[PDB]
Subunit: 146 residues, 12 copies
Amino acid sequence: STKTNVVEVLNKQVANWNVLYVKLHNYHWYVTGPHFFTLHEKFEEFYNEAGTYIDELAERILALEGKPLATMKEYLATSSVNEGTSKESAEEMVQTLVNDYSALIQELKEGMEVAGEAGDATSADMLLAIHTTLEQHVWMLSAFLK
Amino acid sequence: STKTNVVEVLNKQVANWNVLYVKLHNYHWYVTGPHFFTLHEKFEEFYNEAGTYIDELAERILALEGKPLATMKEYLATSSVNEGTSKESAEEMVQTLVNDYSALIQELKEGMEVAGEAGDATSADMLLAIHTTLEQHVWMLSAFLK
Amino acid sequence: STKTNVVEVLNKQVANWNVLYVKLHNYHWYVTGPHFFTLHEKFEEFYNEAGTYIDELAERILALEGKPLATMKEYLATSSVNEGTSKESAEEMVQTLVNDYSALIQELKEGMEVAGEAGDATSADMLLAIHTTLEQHVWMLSAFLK
Amino acid sequence: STKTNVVEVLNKQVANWNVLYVKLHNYHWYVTGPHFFTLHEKFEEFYNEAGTYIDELAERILALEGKPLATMKEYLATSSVNEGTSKESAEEMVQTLVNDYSALIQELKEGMEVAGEAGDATSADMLLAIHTTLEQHVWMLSAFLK
Amino acid sequence: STKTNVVEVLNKQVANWNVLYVKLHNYHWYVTGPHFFTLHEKFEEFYNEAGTYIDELAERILALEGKPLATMKEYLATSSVNEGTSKESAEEMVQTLVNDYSALIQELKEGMEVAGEAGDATSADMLLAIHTTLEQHVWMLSAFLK
Amino acid sequence: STKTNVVEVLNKQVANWNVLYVKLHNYHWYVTGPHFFTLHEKFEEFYNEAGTYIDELAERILALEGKPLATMKEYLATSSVNEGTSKESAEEMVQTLVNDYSALIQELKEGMEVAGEAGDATSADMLLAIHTTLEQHVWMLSAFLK
Amino acid sequence: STKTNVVEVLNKQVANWNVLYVKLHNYHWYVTGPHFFTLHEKFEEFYNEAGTYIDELAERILALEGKPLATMKEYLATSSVNEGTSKESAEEMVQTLVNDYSALIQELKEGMEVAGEAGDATSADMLLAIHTTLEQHVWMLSAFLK
Amino acid sequence: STKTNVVEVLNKQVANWNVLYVKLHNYHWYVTGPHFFTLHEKFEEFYNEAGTYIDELAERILALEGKPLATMKEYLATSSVNEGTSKESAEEMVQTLVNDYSALIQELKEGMEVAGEAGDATSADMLLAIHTTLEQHVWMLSAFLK
Amino acid sequence: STKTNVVEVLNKQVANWNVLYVKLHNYHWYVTGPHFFTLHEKFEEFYNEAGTYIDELAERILALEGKPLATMKEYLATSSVNEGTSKESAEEMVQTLVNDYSALIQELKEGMEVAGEAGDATSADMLLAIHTTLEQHVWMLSAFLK
Amino acid sequence: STKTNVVEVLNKQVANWNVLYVKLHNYHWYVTGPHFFTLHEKFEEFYNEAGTYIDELAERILALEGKPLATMKEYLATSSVNEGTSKESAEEMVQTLVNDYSALIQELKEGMEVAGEAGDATSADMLLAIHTTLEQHVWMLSAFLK
Amino acid sequence: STKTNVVEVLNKQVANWNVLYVKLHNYHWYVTGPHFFTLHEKFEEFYNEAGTYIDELAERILALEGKPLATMKEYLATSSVNEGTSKESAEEMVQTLVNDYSALIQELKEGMEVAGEAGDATSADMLLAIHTTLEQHVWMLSAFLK
Amino acid sequence: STKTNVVEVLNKQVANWNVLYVKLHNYHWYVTGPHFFTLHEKFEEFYNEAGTYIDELAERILALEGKPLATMKEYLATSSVNEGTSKESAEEMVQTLVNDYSALIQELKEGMEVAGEAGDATSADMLLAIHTTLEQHVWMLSAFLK
Ligand SMILES: [Fe+3]
Ligand SMILES: [Fe+3]
Ligand SMILES: [Fe+3]
Ligand SMILES: [Fe+3]
Ligand SMILES: [Fe+3]
Ligand SMILES: [Fe+3]
Ligand SMILES: [Fe+3]
Ligand SMILES: [Fe+3]
Ligand SMILES: [Fe+3]
Ligand SMILES: [Fe+3]
Ligand SMILES: [Fe+3]
Ligand SMILES: [Fe+3]
């Protein structure tokens, strides 16, 4: 792995978390049903984390002398996360998030491989920190769906 | 003015502030020069306000039974703000923001006209609150450029 | 509009919010069902706002040299809000509140007309502030009922 | 004493404290004279305590499987406290409160007898807690009147 | 009653609250269903109180020159609370807790009898404080189950 | 109305609040009598608000590209508020403030007319915010004088 | 028991806690040895509690229309606690406090008897609250002495 | 001046502030009249300062290897402040305090002379700090008496 | 290593920390000697950490779709930590803890091996975090024993 | 030196700090250039200190039975500080402040001479406290100008 | 790698961070130029981190039974960082820090190799934590220099 | 005395406190024995004060246009404090500190003479502030050694 490989892995997540920031706002606004208050709030906490993550990842890429993706056009052309359709039920939103977080978990695992093979412990650790939280999110969200 | 006219004005700003949220991150990350610390921090405060604004505007549209724009594809197709090119100097970034805020100020003025003619005092007031802050931003930023 | 017209509009709301303070306590205490914790807490926040509102409205009437209604007998003879029957389901309570808030929203709209035609910007603004929050409440509560 | 006897004693206080909540607002708003600032603030603290008390007493009645009174019509038909006439001087207001608190103190004493004879230590203790504070209030208020 | 009788009553609760601390963790971890977030959090607050209670009860026994039970083997041989089976539904967990709290309420009542007949007002009061909270818990939890 | 008309109205208040800042210090220092503690503190809170107001008004004038008055010589030549004579009784000080606030209230009303006719909602709102507080002050202060 | 009997019991403690406030300062200042930091701090916390107690007890006597002892000459003529000799070792100070607290515990027990037989639940409870803490202090302090 | 001279001056104040701590409690408890709330609170703040002062002065004497007076018997035999008679009006209490503080101010002045002539800048400064506050107290209290 | 191997390692620690939570309470309650205050407090901080650890470890096992041990019977049958005998001196307690922490350190080292060989970076990191603190504890505790 | 000499020295500073309060607002509002944010904020902190100083100095003059200057007309006729011309560059503003602070430092030195020769340690110390801060300001501001 | 190898790597950093603590104070004190406020503050934050680091590294060496370097003579004989010459411009200071941090980054990388090859995950992680921050510092500081 | 004499006295303390900062870390790390927790913490508080002192003294020298010593080589060549030998017992460490603080107290006394004879009240006061605390430290530390 090279520093450039790590910059690329970091940028994919910058893109993903920007798309997720918007998608979480989508679900935060469009949730309905007796579990409105729970999800509305939950999704807000999630988007808050998404925002901290975008700045963290981007600033680590600057730390390694890289260029963080910084346009919506680029996030859309780079992210692997589908945007909200704003039509799904509360159930669909939670299942979609389990799916999205799950996919991101898989991306983080590979991303940590790349950073490790490039001898980049800090970037690996940053990615790990998100991985740890997303895995917590998936359990709780899957539990919710019973 | 109709409630739908107001929903439209509100959505243009939802789109604008999402694009600005990203653009402010762009400038926050790419700023260089002896005024790095000042701008880096300043732009961060600005993006923080942008984020609060997106949720406020969108939730007011829900309050009026409207659909807030909730996809990046839609923000790009709707916003009137150009995305960061990530190549400008510290000077260019500040001047661009004065220009962006200035244009948004003009949009808010019209937007407040529409809400007023629709008998919508709350939406008018929300828009005013941003207008008041942006005008403060423009003075300080223009002062900076001497 | 005259100052007296505004004092009257303000007093109707003083009466309404006193009746609502009690009604919200009613629902806060009598809620049952798997959404007990959500509503119990929610209604408590609502009654907290009701209490702040009674003092605000009454103190604005003092500010304009008026007499704020200050007896339960007068609130009952003046308010347009029906008291809780303490027998409704969680669903009924939320629907009733949407209805109550909705009616109050309509009263506020007229009340703001009166204050405006009397050249009373402060009272108009106070009434607006509640209007803005109630509209937020109605969206969330209606969302809850799916 | 039976649990029902205790529920009744608790409800009389729920009614009394609701009537007092309004009466304290009355005095808070109508106080005049060089001791305006003192009393205005003092009465506000008093109404704040009244509000906490209504919820506490009512929730203890729920705890014992009872129905807390939850309508203004019922508070008026049950409370032993006369509503404010909003015409009294600062002196009259304080003396009236000494009288009201004093009467409530006597009600609490009997109420604690009933709870004790029903083997209800928690309700007795709750009532005691108010008794302790009201006795403090009476001393200070009587001291004020010299 | 003797001081030793009171030490015994206190130790049964030390044992009970240790077993409950674990059982509450069980339910906190194994809860599933759309009410996951509510119960997960609720049970956490409950275990937090259980922990404060174990230290309080044990330190009162030290205060009376007694030996607080301090081994898991002893808690299991002394507590009257059945451990979680980790297989029950969200409904079962809440009903079980209502049952457990209810039984503990009955134990506290007797325990307060013993302390009173031993002339031990402080221990009686400590036990009362828990009794008061558990009764609040039972109402809310029973309300939840509709 | 023109932007210049609004800048002028804003500057008159900048001048007034500077003169009031000093006058409030005068009364804060020279108050005597059994109501020393009340007024001394009250006047301090008032001067604190006066200081926030000077900066707010001046910064809004900068926001509109105007020059805020910034010399004592200019405040004295522009303000309509008479300076403290430092010889009045506690009664005179409070009555004087009711008079001063009352006059400022009348100035704000006209000032809001001007901003409105210039299409300047933000400046109108800023002025309103003070108007709302001064009216509260006048009621309390007039109440004090019985 | 009569209210006067309770006033007397309360005053003995007002006297005792004033003498203890000074004695605790004595030990706080004169402690030496490797356990200086522990005791110095500990005694400070103890004197802090002593001060809160003096005001609480005295204000309860005012609540019952009594005269709280308020002179050093009277505290010395009434307290049953011997003043510090300022010559004892760290060991002696702790043992003395165990003895002093122990004696006060015995006084509180009787004092609670008197309040109970006078039908004074609040004063009994106040005294209990100190009793509960002193018993905690005695255990810890006796533990310290091994 | 010698270190012993300074220790003596410090001890007179330790004695004075202990006597004042009690006297301030006296006035705090026995104040009556429409200025009850003001004085009651004021005297409490004063006694709070008295308590901090006793520990500060005593710890400075320890710092200079001296023995701080630590018995009530010694404070009474050393202080120059007369104890409260608990019979004076609110007016008398305030005038007495002006007199007491005034006398202490005169003692501090001499005490600072002694510390200065002993080359003890720290003790001089400690004494000064109280002197500065007492002079503030005297102005406010004298102002109160008109 | 497999995910199941990691779940097993995590559960052994869930069991160990539950047993330690109780044992730390044992030492917290039974400590005596001039170092009572130090150890009593220290052990409390230790048990506080033990409690956070149980929830963290268990929630990570849920994250990996495993079943966390949740009964006292299972903790006793699984933990490798001996329960307190409540008879040891302060010295014995500290030495025992050094021994217990030391053994746990060795378990964590192996546990981190297993997580690493299973490609489980998050669980490895969680275990590391405890390892880091326990090693700090052992140094301080060994230092204490000189 | 006499008390009157000290009152005069104190009043000159009351006047100076009032003029400086306005001048600092002048520079706070009129600063421009890339160091806008730095100075704008810096000057605000400076004016905040100026405000605390005016009240402190004036209250010390009351403490010594003097009349603090309390009119703008008197500050202008007494202060030795020239008002802002609102036309200077950022550089000029900072240099002017170094000059103003420097002159005030020289005034404080003389002022402390006067207080010392009048045997007024408290006023001398108050003046010293400002002197200490202004000297810090001058270093930083001179450093800024390179 | 052996534990001793890790102790050595840790001690080199203890020495480096002590030398940096002083050097950062040097730059904090000697900075001049229009970027005085920025750097002065920035360097202070940096020295604050340096201080936390010295204690962390040293306490980890104690944790591994090692001797942390604890004399200035040893830091100077061991550190690889050159001390400040106190003569450099603001530019030189920042460039020097980029160079110093950069060198330390390279030392940390090797140091983490050693800890890893010794099977010391905790020490490796501690070193990583600094590495992560220093890399952030270098980007910002290099950005500043344009 | 001249300003240069004062700069020299200030620099000796800058050197001393830097050497003490390291020495306190030495004792903080190397303390052992049953009083580990006490001293470990105590020494940490002491080093914290040492750090604040270095910056204060150095910034006062900048205030007087002097050059603060800013290299370890210079501190070692200037300080009069011997560095820790890291071999002493807990007893030796405390005695050494009493000796070190005592010597510094003597240096401060002379240093205050110099500042006074140079007409430098601020520097004299700064030095006094440390003197006052060190004398407190010596009493407590000497008390500890019995
Ligand atoms: Fe950032
Ligand atoms: Fe939202
Ligand atoms: Fe109010
Ligand atoms: Fe409630
Ligand atoms: Fe405990
Ligand atoms: Fe400002
Ligand atoms: Fe009190
Ligand atoms: Fe002390
Ligand atoms: Fe949890
Ligand atoms: Fe003041
Ligand atoms: Fe440390
Ligand atoms: Fe500094």
